[PDB]
From Swiss-Prot:
Changing residue 78 to M: Reduced binding to histone H3. Zn(2+) 3 binds at residues 51, 54, 71, 74. Interacts with histone H3. Changing residue 18 to A: 28-fold decrease in affinity for histone H3. Zn(2+) 4 binds at residues 107, 110, 134, 137. The gene is phf14. This is PHD finger protein 14. It is found in: Nucleus. A zinc finger (C2HC pre-PHD-type) spans 48-81. Zn(2+) 5 binds at residues 124, 129, 161, 164. It comes from Danio rerio.
Length: 185
């Protein structure tokens, strides 16, 4: 039986890193992708949160220092976020620099036009490409990648626009993203 991690879109639930599921909302995540009857952090606080950095209300969230909420995935890809905090079991810390970026760019991938200028966009990482999108909008299109440990890249999290993406990687990531809705309550 194949569950999908809503952070990395992988499906391997081995011995060390199992894919656990929130018993309240049904969200599924690698232990290792979340810092880990089990509740996700949002359900432990009885909230269905919105992300400070994107318009998506799906996926899994962590609390910030100031009492707000962000996607784990948005924390991994927005520059200037110390995302190793959740591994250390401490809140996401957003800086003045992060806050000053809200609404600065228009997301080119937004399904709902009303939200294209909300939150914080990332850009394509190929050459000097300047295509902007929310982290979760890129996630939906299969555009978020994590380099393997052996690749020895200091920031292993990167994203490519549709024109520059690995087509194979997009295909199975888009497929696994779509399958996530099937596991929800
Ligand atoms: Mg980064
Ligand atoms: Zn994962
Ligand atoms: Zn939950
Ligand atoms: Zn988000
Ligand atoms: Zn968007
Ligand atoms: Zn590009």
């Amino acid at each position: 039986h194949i569950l999908i991690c809503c952070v990395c879109l992988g499906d391997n639930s081995e011995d060390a890193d199992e894919i656990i599921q929130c018993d309240n909302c049904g969200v599924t995540v690698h232990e290792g992708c979340y810092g880990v009857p089990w509740f996700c952090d949002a359900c432990k606080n009885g909230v269905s949160p919105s992300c400070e950095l994107c318009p998506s209300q799906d996926g899994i969230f962590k609390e910030t220092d100031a009492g707000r909420w962000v996607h784990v995935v948005c924390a991994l890809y927005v520059p200037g976020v110390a995302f190793g905090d959740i591994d250390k079991l401490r809140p996401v810390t957003l800086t003045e620099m992060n806050y000053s970026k809200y609404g600065a760019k228009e997301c080119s991938l937004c399904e709902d036009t009303r939200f294209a200028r909300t939150g914080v966009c990332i850009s394509c990482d190929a050459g000097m490409c300047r295509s902007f999108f929310h982290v979760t909008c890129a996630q939906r299109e299969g555009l978020l990648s994590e380099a393997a440990a052996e690749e020895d890249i200091a920031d292993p999290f990167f994203a490519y626009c549709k024109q520059h993406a690995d087509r194979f990687d997009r295909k199975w990531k888009r497929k696994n993203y779509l399958a996530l809705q099937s596991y929800c309550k």
